[PDB]
């Protein structure tokens, strides 16, 4: 692969001092871009996913508009449960879902052996290699996957609820089966993530998007062990394969209660939602880990001038060290591209000021 | 009205020591009771609401099953926006909603003067008086309403989203109109809540159910001022009318970031969701205010024996002083009544132990 030109994101991720604060946006490749919708309709969501060229194209689209300091491969977190053998339907406007969710312990018998999952996800590896070659070292490429608990919520609920009452019912009524499902997911994720890195990912983000539905007690029993296990095993396999381990980011949305624990889970970066004040996040995590986040994405509905001020304050709160700017969640589809550009420009402009 | 026999809830609420920990459940009157569904179908949700006798009956139903230490009047938070002139439809299975939400600043012109709202909500006052008379002093009766921000989210979205992106778009793009709507809601709530107390409510809970969608910055601008204003003005009007002020409870669901502020907002009790560890909540709030909560309601899917242990631990964490047991959110409709009874019995049993 070509030599990386801008590595600011990787240096920040490892904790090193940098000349400015690197920035990227969750869902930078998303429906808020007209060119994204255009390209999506050229297949059918997952036929888009399954085309390496299509996934590479959607990944690069934002980088043609904005000087983002990383790219993230376009895919979806549900590719994993699909590769385990759950059927998915694209609901037009209403999103990828499982029409037959896991309902009881017996339903685990329909899942593939997790050890075969990586062979099922070869299309994603191909997209990663292609995107790494086409980026030509401009900025690093981040790979990703959903975290075990969160993937579990999608498998058991049908998809997204507002309570995860059904998922949480599993935890309380079927703890043994829950742990079984979570181990299967873990054992599938590890080879998928190692594979992304073999294919050419230069960092990895684990999305624990549905963390907030758990309180501390359930989270420490059912989410945290698997989060730790994913990091430990990925690092080990990479070492053993002769490869350099990559910075890993854990993002637990609505996970204020777990930040202390997450900072000692084997991840270089803890990503934050917008409900946590940066100074309190820094208190909770300590000074080794890097923080990523955390602007309210709805802040981009404000004026460009207002976005600049909100960014200035966010940066003052985080300070220059151990920090990667991002939003506190993914961009929404009605957002204005030029407001995304303002965000990016503002991070770069004010972070330089803050330094000298 | 009859002399209150069991006032444990009120004493805890004011901070006084008690012989045991009082307990009640958000949505104790709810679909998890078969007798609730039975009685609901005898009208049509809001024709139930509008019948004082029907609302009184649903309020008492839980107290016939369980030795709860308070009753809460059955109504809904959307009665306020309805009384302001928004039309509501009961979607069968899918819940009360607004088919014509406020879309822009001009739509505020359709709302009634907030000063007339209390006259529109006379049915609720009648239900309160009736329920206070029929309870015959067994336990105190709690009145309630939605908080201004949260009611705003229902008026602007159509009802419940997952992002409140549209509500938050108002805050960022239409700050002046947002503040206008929030003042209207505040000015309507104050007389409604005073009226509930005049009708015979012995405590009041404000439900800021959608707090978590805001981070600190937006919350301090758009939610907190109105929360404070509601408490200050209710207390004033009651004083002025020659009446005793009642303990007031603020419950901000997903409001971990605001607890410090909420403990100095003029409320005797801060109610907690299940994502906050009780010991950290006590750190944030200090030792004047009473805490209420906070068991994960899904915990009731566990065995009766497990509920007892989870309750034991919850009580050890909160300690005996300044504490009212409750769930961290409302009961879900698939829950088992006998598991609610276990919760209640466990609070009473272990709180007595914890004391001597």
DSSP letters, A280-336, are HHHHHH-SSSEEEEEE-GGGGGS-HHHHHHHHHHHHHHH-SSSEEEEESSPPPTT--
Tell me how far apart the alpha carbons of residues A18 and B270 are, in angstroms, rounded to a whole number. 43
What b/e sequence results for A163-197 when a residue is b if at least 16 CB atoms lie within 10 Å of its CB, and e otherwise?
ebbbbbbbbbebeebbeebbebbbbbbbbbbbbbb
Angle between helices A122-135 and A52-65 (to 10 degrees): 40
Question: In chain A, which residue's Cα lies nearest the Cα of B331?
Answer: A165
Say how many C-beta atoms besides its own lie within 10 A of residue B44's C-beta. Answer: 12
- Residue whose token pair is 């888009």: A48
Measure the CA angle with vertex B283, ends B277 and B284; round to 5°. Answer: 90
Tell me how far apart the alpha carbons of residues A67 and A345 are, in angstroms, rounded to a whole number. 8
* Beta-strand relationship, B89-91 and B95-97: antiparallel
- Residue whose token pair is 């991002």: A326
Q: Do A212 and B254 touch (CB under 8 A)?
A: yes
Tell me how far apart the alpha carbons of residues A196 and A206 are, in angstroms, rounded to a whole number. 13
Inter-CA distances, B266 with B217, B229, B254, Å: 20, 9, 20
Nearest residue to A216 via CA among A175, A253, A258, A251: A258
Nearest residue to A195 via CA among A133, A243, A150, A157: A243
How many helices (H) and strands (E) in chain A?
16, 9
Sheet holding B269-271, edge to edge: B71-72, B141-146, B203-208, B248-252, B269-271, B290-295, B323-327
- DSSP element (H, E) containing A274: none
- Residue whose token pair is 């928004």: B86
Tell me how far apart the alpha carbons of residues A201 and A188 are, in angstroms, rounded to a whole number. 18
Q: How was this structure determined?
A: X-ray
> Residue A250: helix, strand or coil by DSSP?
strand
For residue B225, with 0-12 CB atoms within 10 Å meaning exposed, 13-18 middle and 19 or more buried, which class applies? Answer: middle
Tell me how far apart the alpha carbons of residues B78 and B91 are, in angstroms, rounded to a whole number. 14
Tokens of A242: 């002769």
Handedness of CA B284, B289, B295, B297 (dihedral sign): negative
Nearest to A277 among B162, B216, B276 (CB): B216
Q: Do B212 and A275 touch (CB under 8 A)?
A: yes
Q: Are B292 and B249 in contact (CB under 8 A)?
A: yes
Q: Find the farthest-apart pair of alpha carbons in chain A and give their distance in angstroms, rounded.
A: 62
Q: A115: phi > 0 → left, psi -120 to 50 → alpha, else beta; which?
A: alpha
Most A-contacting residue of B171, B260, B298 (CB-CB within 10 A), to test interface: B298
Per the annotation, does B267 bind a ligand? Answer: no
Tokens of B353: 């132990």
> Residue A205: helix, strand or coil by DSSP?
strand
Pick the catalytic residue from A7, A69, A76, A273.
Answer: A76
Q: Are A204 and A193 in contact (CB under 8 A)?
A: yes
Pick the CATH number of B1-356 from 3.20.20.210, 3.40.1160.10, 3.90.180.10, 2.60.40.10: 3.20.20.210
Nearest residue to B127 via CA among B36, B192, B203, B54: B54
Q: Do B301 and A172 touch (CB under 8 A)?
A: yes
Give contacts of B 256-315 with A, CB under 8 A.
256-257, 274-277, 280, 296, 298-299, 301-302, 306, 310
Tell me how far apart the alpha carbons of residues B13 and B323 are, in angstroms, rounded to a whole number. 8
Most A-contacting residue of B95, B168, B170, B172 (CB-CB within 10 A), to test interface: B172
Q: Phi and psi (nearest 5°) for A327?
A: -80, 170
Per the annotation, does B348 bind a ligand? Answer: no
Q: Are B146 and B210 in contact (CB under 8 A)?
A: no
List CB contacts of B103: < 8 A, sequence separation 6 or more: B156
List CB contacts of A223: < 8 A, sequence separation 6 or more: A147, A148, A149, A208, A211, A214, A252, A258
Q: Do A301 and B276 touch (CB under 8 A)?
A: no
Resolution as reported, in Å: 2.0
Nearest to B162 among A162, A172, A276 (CB): A162
> Residue A270: helix, strand or coil by DSSP?
strand
Angle between helices B337-355 and B304-318 (to 10 degrees): 40
Tell me how far apart the alpha carbons of residues A185 and A153 are, in angstroms, rounded to a whole number. 12
Q: Is A27 a residue of the active site?
A: yes
- Residue whose token pair is 């605001």: B258
Give contacts of B 180-219 with A, CB under 8 A.
212, 214-218
> Residue A204: helix, strand or coil by DSSP?
strand
Q: Are A322 and A291 in contact (CB under 8 A)?
A: yes
Which residues from chain A sit within 8 angstroms of residue B310, using beta carbons? 217
Q: How distant is the Cα of B293 from the closest Cα of chain A, in angstroms?
A: 13
Which residues from chain B sit within 8 angstroms of residue A332, using beta carbons? 163, 165
Measure the CA angle with vertex A166, ends A162 and A171; round to 5°. Answer: 120
Tell me how far apart the alpha carbons of residues A274 and A290 are, in angstroms, rounded to a whole number. 16
Nearest residue to B206 via CA among B174, B168, B232: B232
Tell me how far apart the alpha carbons of residues A226 and A150 are, in angstroms, rounded to a whole number. 11
- DSSP element (H, E) containing A145: strand A141-146
Output the DSSP codes for A80-132: HHHHTT---EEETTTEEE-SS---SGGGGGGSPPGGGHHHHTHHHHHHHHHHH
Q: Are A200 and A141 in contact (CB under 8 A)?
A: yes
Tokens of B152: 């705003």
Q: Do B212 and A254 touch (CB under 8 A)?
A: yes
Q: Given CB atoms, is A103 within the 8 Å cutoff of chain B?
A: no
Tokens of A165: 């009452």
Tell me how far apart the alpha carbons of residues A130 and A2 are, in angstroms, rounded to a whole number. 12
Q: How distant is the Cα of B25 from the closest Cα of chain A, in angstroms?
A: 17
Q: Are B261 and B224 in contact (CB under 8 A)?
A: yes
Inter-CA distances, A31 with A28, A47, A307, A334, B187, Å: 9, 17, 21, 8, 40
Handedness of CA B175, B178, B180, B183 (dihedral sign): negative
Nearest residue to A117 via CA among A233, A195, A211: A195
End-to-end Cα distance, chain B: 35
Nearest to B274 among A173, A215, A310 (CB): A215
- DSSP element (H, E) containing A133: helix A122-135
Q: Given CB atoms, is A162 within the 8 Å cutoff of chain B?
A: yes
Q: Do A215 and B162 touch (CB under 8 A)?
A: no
Which residues from chain B sit within 8 angstroms of residue A334, using beta carbons? 165
| B269, B273, B278, B279: CA torsion to nearest 10 | -90
Most B-contacting residue of A167, A275, A297 (CB-CB within 10 A), to test interface: A275
Chains A and B form CB pairs within 8 A to the count of 84
| B255, B259, B260, B262: CA torsion to nearest 10 | 100
Q: Do B215 and A332 touch (CB under 8 A)?
A: no
Which residues from chain B sit within 8 angstroms of residue A301, using beta carbons? 168-169, 172-173
List CB contacts of A284: < 8 A, sequence separation 6 or more: A259, A260, A263
Q: Are A147 and A80 in contact (CB under 8 A)?
A: no
Tokens of A204: 């990895």
Q: Given CB atoms, is A163 within the 8 Å cutoff of chain B?
A: yes
Tokens of A201: 């990912």
Tell me how far apart the alpha carbons of residues A127 and A145 are, in angstroms, rounded to a whole number. 15
Pick the catalytic residue from A40, A158, A174, A183.
Answer: A40
Which residues from chain A sit within 8 angstroms of residue B218, using beta carbons? 296
Say how many C-beta atoms besides its own lie within 10 A of residue A120's C-beta. Answer: 17
For residue B197, with 0-12 CB atoms within 10 Å meaning exposed, 13-18 middle and 19 or more buried, which class applies? Answer: buried
- DSSP element (H, E) containing A271: strand A269-271
Most B-contacting residue of A298, A300, A304, A343 (CB-CB within 10 A), to test interface: A298
Tokens of B238: 């009651």
Tell me how far apart the alpha carbons of residues A147 and A152 are, in angstroms, rounded to a whole number. 9
Say how many C-beta atoms besides its own lie within 10 A of residue A114's C-beta. Answer: 20
Print the SS3 string covering chain B: CCCCCCCHHHHHHHCCCCCCCCECCCCCCCCCCHHHHHHHCCCCHHHHHCCHHHHHHHHHHHHHHCCCCCEECCCCCCHHHHHCCCCCEEECCCEEECCCCCCCHHHHHHCCCHHHHHHHCHHHHHHHHHHHHHHCCCCCEEEEEECHHHHHHHHHHCCCCCCCHHHHHHHHHCHHHHHHHHHHHHHHHHHHHHHHHHHCCCEEEEEECCHHHCCHHHHHHHCHHHHHHHHHHHHHHHHHCCCCCCCEEEEECCCHHHHHHHCCCCCCEEECCCCCCHHHHHHHHCCCCEEEEEECHHHHHCCHHHHHHHHHHHHHHHCCCCEEEEECCCCCCCCCHHHHHHHHHHHHHHHHHHHC
Tell me how far apart the alpha carbons of residues A278 and A44 are, in angstroms, rounded to a whole number. 39
- Residue whose token pair is 């030792």: B287
Nearest residue to A193 via CA among A206, A207, A211, A210: A206
Tell me how far apart the alpha carbons of residues B21 and B324 are, in angstroms, rounded to a whole number. 6
Per the annotation, does B27 bind a ligand? Answer: yes
Per the annotation, does A154 bind a ligand? Answer: yes
Measure the CA angle with vertex A191, ends A188 and A194; round to 5°. Answer: 140
> Residue A144: helix, strand or coil by DSSP?
strand
Measure the CA angle with vertex B266, ends B284 and B126; round to 5°. Answer: 125
Q: How distant is the Cα of B241 from the closest Cα of chain A, in angstroms?
A: 40
Nearest residue to B355 via CA among B328, B329, B316, B310: B316
Tell me how far apart the alpha carbons of residues A243 and A188 are, in angstroms, rounded to a whole number. 20
Tokens of B146: 């939605």
Tell me how far apart the alpha carbons of residues B332 and A169 are, in angstroms, rounded to a whole number. 11
Tokens of B245: 């002020």
Question: In chain A, which residue's Cα lies nearest the Cα of B328?
Answer: A215
Q: Phi and psi (nearest 5°) for A329?
A: -160, 180
> Residue A272: helix, strand or coil by DSSP?
coil
Which residues from chain A sit within 8 angstroms of residue B215, using beta carbons? 274-277, 296, 328
Tell me how far apart the alpha carbons of residues B345 and B355 are, in angstroms, rounded to a whole number. 16
Nearest residue to B30 via CA among B4, B65, B78: B65
Q: Is A40 a residue of the active site?
A: yes
Q: Are A268 and A247 in contact (CB under 8 A)?
A: yes
What b/e sequence results for A205-233 when a residue is b if at least 16 CB atoms lie within 10 Å of its CB, and e otherwise?
bbbbbbbbbbbbbbbeebbbbbbbbbbeb
Tell me how far apart the alpha carbons of residues B223 and A20 are, in angstroms, rounded to a whole number. 35
Q: Do B162 and A160 touch (CB under 8 A)?
A: yes
Q: Do B160 and A163 touch (CB under 8 A)?
A: no
Tell me how far apart the alpha carbons of residues A293 and A270 are, in angstroms, rounded to a whole number. 9
């Amino acid at each position: 692969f070509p030599e990386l030109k801008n590595d600011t994101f990787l240096r920040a991720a490892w904790g090193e001092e940098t000349d400015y604060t690197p920035v990227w946006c969750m869902r930078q490749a998303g429906r808020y871009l007209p060119e994204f919708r255009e390209t999506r309709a050229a297949q059918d969501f997952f036929s888009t996913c399954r085309s390496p060229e299509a996934c590479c194209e959607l990944t690069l689209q934002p980088l043609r508009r904005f000087p983002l300091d990383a790219a993230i491969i376009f895919s979806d977190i549900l590719v994993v449960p699909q590769a385990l053998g759950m059927e998915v339907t694209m609901v037009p406007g209403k999103g990828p879902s499982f029409p037959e969710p896991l309902r009881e312990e017996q339903d685990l018998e329909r899942l593939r052996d997790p050890e075969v999952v990586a062979s099922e996800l070869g299309y994603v590896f191909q997209a990663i290699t292609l995107t790494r070659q086409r980026l030509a070292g401009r900025v690093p490429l981040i790979g990703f996957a959903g975290a075990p608990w969160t993937l579990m919520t999608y498998m058991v609920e049908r998809g997204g609820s507002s309570t995860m009452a059904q998922a949480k019912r599993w935890l309380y009524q079927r703890p043994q089966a829950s742990h079984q499902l979570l181990r299967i997911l873990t054992d599938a994720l590890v080879p998928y993530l190692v594979g992304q890195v073999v294919a050419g990912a230069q960092a990895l983000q684990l999305f624990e998007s549905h963390a907030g539905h758990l309180g501390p007690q359930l989270f420490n029993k059912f989410a945290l062990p698997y989060i730790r296990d994913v990091a430990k095993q990925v690092k080990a396999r990479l070492r053993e394969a002769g490869l350099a381990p990559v910075p890993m980011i854990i993002f637990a949305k609505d996970g204020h209660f777990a930040l202390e624990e997450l900072a000692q889970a084997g991840y270089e970066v803890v990503g934050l939602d917008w409900t946590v004040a940066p100074k309190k996040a820094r208190e909770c995590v300590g000074k080794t880990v890097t923080l990523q986040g955390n602007l309210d994405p709805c802040a981009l509905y404000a004026s460009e001038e207002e976005i600049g001020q909100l960014v200035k304050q966010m940066l003052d709160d985080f300070g220059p060290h151990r920090y990667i700017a991002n939003l506190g969640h993914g961009l929404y589809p009605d957002m204005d591209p030029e407001h995304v550009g303002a965000f990016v420009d503002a991070v770069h402009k004010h972070s330089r000021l803050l330094r000298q």
